[PDB]
Design a protein around this motif. Structure first.
Motif, short mmCIF file in Angstrom:
data_model
loop_
_atom_site.label_atom_id
_atom_site.label_comp_id
_atom_site.label_asym_id
_atom_site.label_seq_id
_atom_site.Cartn_x
_atom_site.Cartn_y
_atom_site.Cartn_z
N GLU A 162 36.19 -27.83 78.75
CA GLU A 162 35.87 -26.77 79.69
C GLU A 162 35.64 -25.65 79.05
OE1 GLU A 162 35.36 -26.14 82.99
OE2 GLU A 162 35.29 -23.89 82.46
N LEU A 163 36.05 -25.13 77.91
CA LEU A 163 35.87 -23.79 77.36
C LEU A 163 34.52 -23.81 76.60
CD1 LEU A 163 38.05 -21.90 77.90
CD2 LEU A 163 39.28 -22.43 75.76
N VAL A 164 34.30 -24.96 76.12
CA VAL A 164 32.89 -24.96 75.44
C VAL A 164 31.80 -25.10 76.79
CG1 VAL A 164 31.15 -26.52 74.50
CG2 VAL A 164 33.55 -26.15 73.46
N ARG A 166 31.91 -23.61 79.65
CA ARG A 166 31.79 -22.44 80.18
C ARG A 166 31.31 -21.23 79.06
NH1 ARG A 166 37.36 -20.20 82.05
NH2 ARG A 166 36.69 -21.88 83.35
N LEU A 167 31.16 -21.65 77.97
CA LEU A 167 30.51 -20.96 76.98
C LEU A 167 28.83 -21.24 77.16
CD1 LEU A 167 30.19 -19.53 73.92
CD2 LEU A 167 30.35 -21.73 73.02
N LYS A 168 28.51 -22.36 77.12
CA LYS A 168 27.15 -22.83 77.51
C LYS A 168 26.64 -21.95 78.75
CE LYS A 168 26.97 -25.14 74.03
NZ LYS A 168 27.26 -26.55 73.95
N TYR A 172 30.46 -15.19 80.42
CA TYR A 172 30.40 -13.82 79.65
C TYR A 172 29.25 -12.93 79.82
CZ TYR A 172 28.79 -17.30 76.52
OH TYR A 172 27.77 -18.29 75.88
N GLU B 196 42.58 -15.79 80.54
CA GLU B 196 41.85 -16.74 81.42
C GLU B 196 42.26 -17.95 82.22
OE1 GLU B 196 38.05 -17.61 79.10
OE2 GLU B 196 39.20 -16.33 77.63
N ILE B 198 41.73 -21.66 83.57
CA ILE B 198 41.07 -23.20 83.90
C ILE B 198 41.80 -23.83 84.84
CG2 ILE B 198 39.66 -22.83 81.88
CD1 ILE B 198 41.34 -24.51 80.25
N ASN B 200 42.13 -27.91 86.53
CA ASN B 200 41.48 -29.17 86.81
C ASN B 200 41.88 -30.13 87.65
OD1 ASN B 200 41.89 -28.40 83.17
ND2 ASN B 200 39.74 -27.87 84.19
N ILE B 224 38.05 -10.90 77.97
CA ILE B 224 37.21 -11.92 76.82
C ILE B 224 37.60 -11.74 75.37
CG2 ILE B 224 35.03 -12.21 75.73
CD1 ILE B 224 35.49 -13.87 78.29
N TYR B 246 42.65 -19.88 72.03
CA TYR B 246 41.51 -20.60 71.54
C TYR B 246 40.60 -19.75 70.48
CZ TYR B 246 38.47 -18.12 74.80
OH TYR B 246 37.90 -17.08 75.73
N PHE B 248 36.56 -20.56 68.84
CA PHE B 248 35.44 -21.67 68.85
C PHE B 248 35.16 -21.70 67.10
CE2 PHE B 248 34.91 -19.61 72.96
CZ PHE B 248 34.47 -20.80 73.79
N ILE B 258 30.36 -27.73 68.56
CA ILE B 258 31.43 -26.64 68.70
C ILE B 258 32.80 -27.13 69.38
CG2 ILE B 258 29.82 -24.77 68.36
CD1 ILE B 258 29.41 -24.87 71.45
N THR B 260 36.93 -25.70 69.91
CA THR B 260 38.01 -24.83 69.93
C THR B 260 39.30 -25.11 69.33
OG1 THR B 260 39.30 -25.08 71.98
CG2 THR B 260 36.98 -24.25 72.25
#
Lengths: 192, 305, 148, 125
Positions: A162-164, A166-168, A172, B196, B198, B200, B224, B246, B248, B258, B260
Motif C-alpha cells: 500500500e505504501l508503494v 500511494r507513492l505512485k 503527497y 500516517e 493505512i 485494509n 510526511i 518506513y 523507500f 521499490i 520499504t
RNA sequence: AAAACUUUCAGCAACGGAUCUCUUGGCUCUCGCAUCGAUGAAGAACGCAGCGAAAUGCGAUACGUAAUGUGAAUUG
RNA sequence: UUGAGAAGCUCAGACGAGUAGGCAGGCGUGGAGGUUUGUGACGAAGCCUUGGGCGUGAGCCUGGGUCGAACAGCCUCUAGUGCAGAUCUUGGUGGAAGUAGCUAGAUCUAGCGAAACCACAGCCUGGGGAACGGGCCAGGC
RNA sequence: AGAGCAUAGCUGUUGGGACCCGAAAGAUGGUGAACCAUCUAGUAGCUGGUUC
RNA sequence: UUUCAAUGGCCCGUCUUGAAACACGGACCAAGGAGUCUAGCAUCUAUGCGAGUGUUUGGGUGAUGAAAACCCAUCCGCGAA
RNA sequence: AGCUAAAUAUUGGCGAGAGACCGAUAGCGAACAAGUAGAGUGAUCGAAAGAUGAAAAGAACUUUGAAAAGAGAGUUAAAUAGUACGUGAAAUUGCUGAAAGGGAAGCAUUGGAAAUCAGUCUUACCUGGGUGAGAUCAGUAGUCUCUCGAGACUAUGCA
C-alpha cells in the motif's frame, strides 16, 4: 432428649457439620452463630431462638420444647420492625425470661443481618463492573485462529504494497519528502 | 478402525502410506513429463488448480461493499456521527485516553505507548466513582471527540472500549497479544511526527463503521517528513494494530523494484470486536448495533468485519 | 508444525525440516553449530568446500578423537574433520529452505541462517542416533534513519 | 429396577451384547420414533428404520434436515440420508452418518411385511 | 575476566511413556444342566474365502446347501 | 460477660538430649455404607509453575498454564495402603564415546560403530590419635 | 450368700509358605553322563532389605 | 528465584566397632517392591445378657436382590459344682 | 452271591447371574495376530503389544526434491489430536536467553544487588433540613394459611 440428641449429633455425625481446622461450622439454617457448639445447636436445644432474613425482612424464629414432635409447627415467626430500637425491644419482649445468652445471640444476629441488608442496598445503587467468565474452549479457539490470521495477514507485505501504491498515486505534494532523490527518479521514469 | 491390534494396524497403515506415496509419485512424474513436453497442459492446470484458502472460500454475505460507487451508501455517511471529520469542516480529533479504576503500572506502560501513536491525545487517571457515561458527558463539554477507555485487571490490559463524543457509536474490543516497544526485536524510537494511517480488509458494511471510527482518531494531515505509518489490518475478524517507520529503497521483488524497509515502533496488539452500541457506552441499557456470537464464529470461513 | 525458535512466523522466515534423518547426531550437531548465523549464500560455498576438502568443520563440543588440522584456524581451534554425509543432509535442507523463501517472495540477497537446531531422533548393541534437523532462514534485520 | 434373574444389569455384558450384536439384532437396535401424525394414526410409537424411509433429523449439526434413507450402516449403527453430506478436501461429498434415534420417521416405506407389523403391534391402517 | 569451554537457572524443541481417566479382559463366588467316539471322536494336515493383515468360518455342495423365522440388506 | 463442641472454657507452676523398647495423637492411598438438597464441558481428574497462603511436620488449600469427563470434603467400614537402598524387578536413559575398533578412498580421510566401569570428586605439605587423604585444621599453589 | 458365657477389638504367643530376597538339592516321570517338567512356596540359627 | 559476600558444612544406607577405621550396597529416573490371611491359646478393654450364656448343623421365612434381614424346634459346648 | 433312588461331591463340560476383587509392569502366560511370534535335535519353553476424533472430515491443491520428506495451504471445537496419533511426568538431549566461573560442585545462616510477586486504599458512620416516595404507619376496609393474634397478600390513604 436434649442431652441424648447432642451426644448423637454433636459427637457422632451431623449432616450439617463443616469440619474446619480451627472451628466446626453448622450448615443449619436455624443456627444463630453459624458454629457447631452445644449452645448454638438448633437440634440439641429444645428452646431456641434465631433471626433470619426473608426477601428483605428480618424475622424472629422461636421454638419450644412442647412443639418438638410437630415439625410443620415447630418454629414460630414474628416480624421485626425496620426501626432498630423497636427491633431490639421486639426480641426482648418475645424472648422474655429466656436466658441472657440466647437473647444476646439473637440481637447479635439482628445487627449482622441489618448491616448485610444495608450493604446489599448500597451495592444496588453503585455501578459495579459485571464479572464475565473466561471460557477455556473459546480462548483456545481464538488463540489458534489468531495465529493463522496473523500469518495469513502478511502485514509487512501488505503495508509496503500500500505504501508503494500511494507513492505512485502521488498522495503527497509535487515530490514526496520521504523519498531519496535516486528513488524518486526511478519512480518518475517507471510510472511514466 | 477395523483392526484391534495396534502393531498390525501400524504395519497396515505404513504399507498403505508407502503405496499412496509411490502411486502418487508415479502420477506426478508422469504428469510432469507429459506437461513439460506440451506447455499447454501446464498453463491450463495452473490456472484451473488454484489452491484454496479460507479467504477464497469465505461464506457469502451480501453486506459486503462493492467496487462501484453507490449513492445510497455515500448519502448515509455524509450526515452520520463521523461526518464532522470527513466533511469540509475537518474537525481535528481530540482524544481522551483513560483506564479502568485502580489501574497498575503495566497498564500505564501500554497507555504511554498508546499515547505515542496519537499526537494530540491526553491521559486522565480514572478516579473514584465516575462512570463512562459521565466521563463522556464531561469530556464532550471540554472539546473532546473520542474517548478511549482501557480495561485492565490482574495487571493485564484485556479490553478497549472507544466511544465517539457526544452521542456517537461506542465500540467494545478485547485486546490480546499486547507487546510494548521494548519487547519487539529490532524496534525503533517513535518521534513526535503525526503517523500516517493505512486500513485494509474492512470489506463488510460493518467494517466501514469500524474503519471510519478508527480513521476518525487520526489527524487527517499526516506529517510526511517523519514517515511513520500506523496500520490497522482486519484479517479473519482480527484487527492487528502496528506502527512502523518506513523508508523507500530498492528491492528485487516488486515489478517496479521499490520496497520499504519497515522498522517496528510499537505498541503491537490485536483487537477483536465484541459489541457495537448505538450511542454512549452503557453495558446494561445500550442499543446493540452488533453483538458477536461465539457459536457462529466457530465457522472459520464466516466473518463479520 | 512449530519449531524450537519463536521466529518462523510468515514475516520473513522460511522453514526447512528433516525428521529421522539417517546420520550421526554428534556429527550433525557440529555442522549445525558452524553454519548457524551465517549468510545463506556463504553457507552454500562452505558446504561446497567441505565436500571437496577445501574447508574443515571444527568439532568443539564432541571434540574427542578429532585430530589436529590446519584448516580450523578460521574458527580459532584446531580440532576439525570433513564430514560428508552430515554435510549432504544440511545441503538438502538449505536448498529446501532457499526454495521455500523463493516461493514466499522473500528478498534472496539478505537471507541468513537465523536458527538451526539438531535434535536426537529415536534410537534404532548397535543402536545408532538418528537426527532431527530444523533450519530457519530470514533476512538480516536493518534500521532506518529516524527523522533527519 | 429389574427383578428377573434372566436379564443382566452388568455393564460388561450389556456393552458386549450391544457391540457384538449380529445383523438381525441390529435391525431392532436401529429403531426410530414416528412423527406425531404417524404415531397417532398408526398407533405405533417407534419402528426399526429401513431404506426409502423419509425422516427428519432432530439432533446434531444437521438438525432440521429431511430426506430419504439411502442406506443403513449397521456395522457402525449409522443412517445415511440423501443430500446430508459433507464436503471433502477434493470437493467430493462424503455422506454423514446419523444415529437412528436422532431422526424421526415422517413417512413410512409401507410394505406388506410392515403392514403386517403395524397390525401386529396393536396398530391400524 | 568477554568469546569458546564448563556450571547453574529459565524458555522452546526433542526423547521417553509415567500419571490420570476407561475397558467387548481377567479373577473370585453362587446357581442350573448332563451331552464324545468304529453311524469314525479329540487332535493333526491340506484345501475353499473376488481381495481380505491375520483371525474366524467352511469342506470339492468348501467364510456353506435344505427347512423355518424375521423381512431389505451387504460394506474395508 | 454472653467464655456449656463439660469431648468446652479457664487459671497456675514446673519441665524439654535420646539408641533398643513402651505409649499417644495425627497425615496420606484404593474400595464400601452414610452424608455434603456437594464440585464439573462457564472445564472433573491428572500434570507443569522463580505465583500466593496454611501446618512444628506428614501434608493441605489456592492463582496461572496445560488438559478433556469425571470427582471430592465430613462420620464410619475396609485393605494387595505410603520406599532411596534389597550386587532388588521391569522399562527408559546417560557419562565412558564418536572412544575401542571394523567397511572404503588416499598412517590420513570417509562410512559404520561398541562394551567393561560409573556415590561425588580429583595439586601438594604437614598435623590430625579411629584410616585419615579425596573432602577436615594451618600453609603453599 | 456362685461369675460366667458370647461377640468385637488390642497385645503376646504357637502352627501353617507365615515379613521379603536369599543354600548343593533329592525324588518321581520324561527327552536326546547330559537335558526337561512337576513335587516346591523343600530345607536358612545365616546374608541383604523391610515404605508416613 | 538467581547470584554475590561473611561464617559454617567430610557421602548416604547397612554391618562392624567404645568409637571410628572399615568392608560392603549406590551411574541416573519412572513404575512395581516386603509382619499378610487363617486356626488355637492367654492377658487386657469394650458390648450384650447374667447362674446362666451362645440364633446362622439345620428348619421356618424372606414378592421392592431372596447368598441379606427376620424367626427358633431339638440338642450340644462352656460355666454353676 | 446280587441290585437299589434321595440327601453328598464337583478348578472339567453346556449355560447363567453376580461381586466392598484387578484396572494394561495389575488381573489368566494371553483385554490386541496368545499357547501366537519366537527358541530348542527333542522333551519342553514362551513373550512384548490397549486409547486420533463426535465424524476420516486421514490434509485436495500449488511448490522444492532422485526419493523419503519439507514448505505454502486445507479439515476440525481442538492438529498443544496428523495413524511416531487421548493426557504426555522424571531421567536424558539440542537450541536460545540470563548469570557465574585460580584444581570441584555442594548445602545451611544473614543480608545486598537484579529479576519477579503478594498488597492492601475513603467509605463509611453521626447529625440534620428540604423534597417527594411507601409498610411492618393508618382516629382504615377485605382475602388466604395457622391459631383472639401470628404470618402472606389485596384495595385505599402517605396526615
Amino acid at each position: 432428649q436434649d442431652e441424648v440428641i447432642w451426644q448423637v449429633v454433636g459427637h457422632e455425625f451431623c449432616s450439617y457439620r463443616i469440619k474446619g481446622e480451627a472451628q466446626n461450622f453448622c450448615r443449619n439454617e436455624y443456627n444463630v452463630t453459624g458454629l457447631c457448639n452445644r449452645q448454638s445447636c438448633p437440634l440439641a436445644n429444645s428452646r431456641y431462638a434465631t433471626v433470619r432474613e426473608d426477601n428483605g425482612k428480618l424475622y424472629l424464629y422461636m421454638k419450644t420444647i412442647e412443639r418438638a414432635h410437630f415439625p410443620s409447627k415447630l418454629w414460630q415467626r414474628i416480624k421485626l420492625s425496620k426501626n432498630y430500637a423497636k427491633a431490639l425491644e421486639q426480641i426482648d419482649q418475645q424472648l422474655l425470661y429466656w436466658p441472657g445468652r440466647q437473647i444476646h445471640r439473637c440481637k447479635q444476629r439482628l445487627t449482622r443481618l441489618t448491616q448485610y441488608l444495608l450493604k446489599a442496598r448500597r451495592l444496588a445503587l453503585k455501578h459495579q463492573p459485571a464479572l464475565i467468565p473466561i471460557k477455556p474452549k473459546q480462548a483456545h479457539r481464538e488463540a489458534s485462529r489468531e495465529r493463522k490470521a496473523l500469518i495469513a495477514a502478511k502485514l509487512e507485505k501488505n503495508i509496503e504494497k500500500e505504501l508503494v501504491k500511494r507513492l505512485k498515486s502521488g498522495v503527497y505534494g509535487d515530490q514526496p519528502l520521504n523519498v531519496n532523490e535516486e528513488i524518486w527518479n526511478k519512480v518518475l521514469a517507471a510510472r511514466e | 478402525g477395523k483392526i484391534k491390534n495396534k502393531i498390525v494396524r501400524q504395519q497396515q497403515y505404513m504399507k498403505a502410506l508407502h503405496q499412496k506415496n509411490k502411486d502418487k509419485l508415479e502420477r506426478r512424474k508422469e504428469r510432469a513429463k507429459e506437461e513439460e513436453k506440451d506447455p499447454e497442459k501446464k498453463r491450463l492446470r495452473l490456472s484451473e488448480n488454484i489452491p484454496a484458502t479460507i479467504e477464497s472460500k469465505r461464506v457469502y454475505d451480501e453486506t459486503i461493499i462493492e467496487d462501484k460507487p453507490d449513492e445510497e451508501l455515500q448519502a448515509e455517511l455524509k450526515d452520520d456521527e463521523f461526518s464532522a471529520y470527513f466533511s469540509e469542516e475537518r474537525k481535528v480529533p481530540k482524544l481522551l485516553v483513560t483506564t479502568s479504576k485502580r489501574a497498575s503500572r503495566k497498564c500505564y506502560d501500554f497507555a504511554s505507548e498508546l499515547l505515542d501513536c496519537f499526537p494530540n491525545a491526553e491521559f486522565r487517571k480514572r478516579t473514584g466513582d465516575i462512570e463512562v457515561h459521565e466521563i463522556a458527558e464531561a469530556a464532550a463539554k471540554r472539546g473532546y471527540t473520542d474517548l478511549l477507555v482501557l480495561n485492565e485487571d490482574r495487571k493485564k490490559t484485556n479490553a478497549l472500549t472507544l466511544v465517539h463524543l457526544p452521542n456517537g457509536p461506542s465500540f467494545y474490543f478485547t485486546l490480546s497479544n499486547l507487546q510494548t516497544a521494548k519487547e519487539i526485536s529490532n524496534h525503533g524510537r517513535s518521534t513526535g511526527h503525526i503517523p500516517e494511517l493505512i486500513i485494509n480488509n474492512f470489506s463488510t458494511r460493518l467494517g466501514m463503521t469500524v474503519a471510519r471510527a478508527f480513521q476518525s482518531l487520526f489527524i487527517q494531515t499526516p506529517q510526511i517528513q517523519g514517515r511513520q505509518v500506523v496500520t490497522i489490518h482486519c484479517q479473519r475478524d482480527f484487527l492487528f494494530f502496528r506502527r512502523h517507520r518506513y523508508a523507500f529503497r530498492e528491492k528485487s521483488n516488486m515489478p517496479d523494484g521499490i520496497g520499504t524497509g519497515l522498522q517496528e515502533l510499537g505498541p503491537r496488539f490485536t483487537m477483536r470486536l465484541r459489541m457495537v452500541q448505538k450511542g454512549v457506552w452503557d453495558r446494561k441499557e445500550g442499543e446493540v448495533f452488533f453483538e458477536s456470537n461465539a457459536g457462529e464464529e466457530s465457522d472459520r470461513r464466516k466473518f463479520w468485519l | 508444525v512449530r519449531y524450537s525458535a519463536s521466529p518462523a512466523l510468515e514475516t520473513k522466515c522460511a522453514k526447512a525440516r528433516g525428521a529421522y534423518l539417517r546420520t550421526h547426531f554428534k556429527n550433525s550437531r557440529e555442522v549445525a553449530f558452524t553454519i548457524n548465523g551465517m549468510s545463506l549464500k556463504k553457507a552454500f560455498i562452505f558446504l561446497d568446500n567441505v565436500k571437496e576438502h577445501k574447508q574443515a568443520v571444527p568439532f568443539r563440543r564432541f571434540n574427542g578423537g578429532v585430530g589436529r588440522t590446519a584448516q580450523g584456524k578460521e574458527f580459532g581451534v584446531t580440532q576439525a574433520r570433513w564430514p560428508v554425509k552430515s554435510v549432504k543432509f544440511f545441503y538438502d535442507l538449505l536448498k529446501n529452505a532457499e526454495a521455500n523463501a523463493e516461493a514466499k517472495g522473500l528478498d534472496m540477497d539478505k537471507l541468513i541462517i537465523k536458527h538451526v537446531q539438531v535434535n536426537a531422533a529415536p534410537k534404532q548393541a548397535y543402536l545408532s542416533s538418528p537426527s532431527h534437523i530444523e533450519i530457519i532462514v530470514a533476512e538480516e534485520e536493518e534500521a532506518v534513519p529516524k527523522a533527519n | 429396577m429389574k427383578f428377573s434373574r434372566d436379564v443382566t444389569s452388568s455393564r460388561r455384558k450389556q456393552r458386549k451384547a450391544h457391540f457384538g450384536a449380529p445383523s438381525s439384532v441390529r435391525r431392532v437396535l436401529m429403531s426410530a420414533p414416528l412423527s406425531k401424525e404417524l404415531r397417532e394414526q398408526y398407533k405405533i410409537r417407534s419402528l426399526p428404520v429401513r431404506r426409502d424411509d423419509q425422516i427428519t433429523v432432530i439432533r446434531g449439526s444437521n438438525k432440521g434436515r429431511e430426506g430419504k434413507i439411502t442406506s443403513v450402516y449397521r456395522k457402525k449403527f449409522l443412517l445415511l440420508i440423501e443430500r446430508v453430506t459433507r464436503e471433502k478436501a477434493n470437493g467430493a461429498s462424503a455422506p454423514v452418518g446419523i444415529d437412528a434415534s436422532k431422526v424421526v420417521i415422517t413417512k413410512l416405506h409401507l410394505d406388506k411385511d410392515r403392514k403386517d407389523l403395524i397390525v401386529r403391534k396393536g396398530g391400524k391402517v
